């Protein structure tokens, strides 16, 4: 038998409890970064390692700018939730 919850992965845009940023013209910080890292690395790296690069890209390259001090100068870390049981490569 295997667990019924085995072999799921959740790639969340943000930490539990947190806001998630989206730009009117570029899209969301997370999806833009995810697509970029998949484009660059899906034929090269295991999926958790791609998602780790996505974490770094979102964490380092994005910061909010807002006229409202409440929402200004904010940062985001995505959150990988793996219940996978094997490494995942998009190529073979």
């Amino acid at each position: 038998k295997i667990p019924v919850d085995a072999d799921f992965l959740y790639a969340y845009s943000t930490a539990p409890g947190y806001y998630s940023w989206r730009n009117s013209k570029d899209g969301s910080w997370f999806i833009q970064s995810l697509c970029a890292m998949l484009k660059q690395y899906a034929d090269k790296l295991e999926f958790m390692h791609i998602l780790t690069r996505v974490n770094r890209k979102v964490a380092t390259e994005f910061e909010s700018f807002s006229f409202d001090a409440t929402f200004h100068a904010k940062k985001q870390i995505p959150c990988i939730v793996s219940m996978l049981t094997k490494e995942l490569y998009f190529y073979h």
Binding site: I2, D7, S28, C35, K75, E87, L88
Partner: protein, 146 residues
């Protein structure tokens, strides 16, 4: 055969699998939810990115809570025998554990339960990936200078 290790998922089935993208941009008035400007940029980027990974991409726009549940139920009832994996991307407003249809919330657990190992037998043992662009709450991260 030589030594066989089972450290990576079998990803050489005839099909990589489905990539369902739910793109919720426009919301009903009484929900009080703003239009998600930029989400189409995300949706196009994802369709192209997963196309190049050989996923069968299906885009769905502005689904109600009922339509989300119906879509996922129907997708989980397909025969995925010849497919390596399953991908679902959710682009919407959200809160912890919740994604918004155009007319109200859906528990993420309700969506993912359809794909449990006991409920979608043709995906048992295969990676099921849920990619979620939505808030998980209202907290803001102030960051720290390095």
């Amino acid at each position: 055969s030589g030594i066989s290790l089972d450290n990576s998922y079998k990803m050489d089935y005839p099909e990589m699998g489905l990539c369902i993208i739910i793109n919720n941009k426009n919301f009903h008035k009484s929900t009080g939810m703003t239009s998600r400007s930029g989400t189409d940029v995300d949706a196009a980027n994802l369709r192209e990115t997963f196309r190049n990974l050989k996923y069968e991409v299906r885009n769905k726009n502005d689904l109600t809570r009922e339509e989300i549940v119906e879509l996922m139920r129907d997708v989980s009832k397909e025969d995925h025998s010849k497919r390596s994996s399953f991908v679902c991307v959710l682009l919407s407003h959200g809160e912890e554990g919740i994604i918004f249809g155009t007319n109200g919330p859906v528990d993420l657990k309700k969506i993912t339960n359809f794909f449990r190992g006991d409920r979608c037998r043709s995906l048992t043992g295969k990676p099921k990936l849920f990619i979620i662009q939505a808030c998980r709450g209202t907290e803001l991260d102030c960051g720290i200078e390095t």
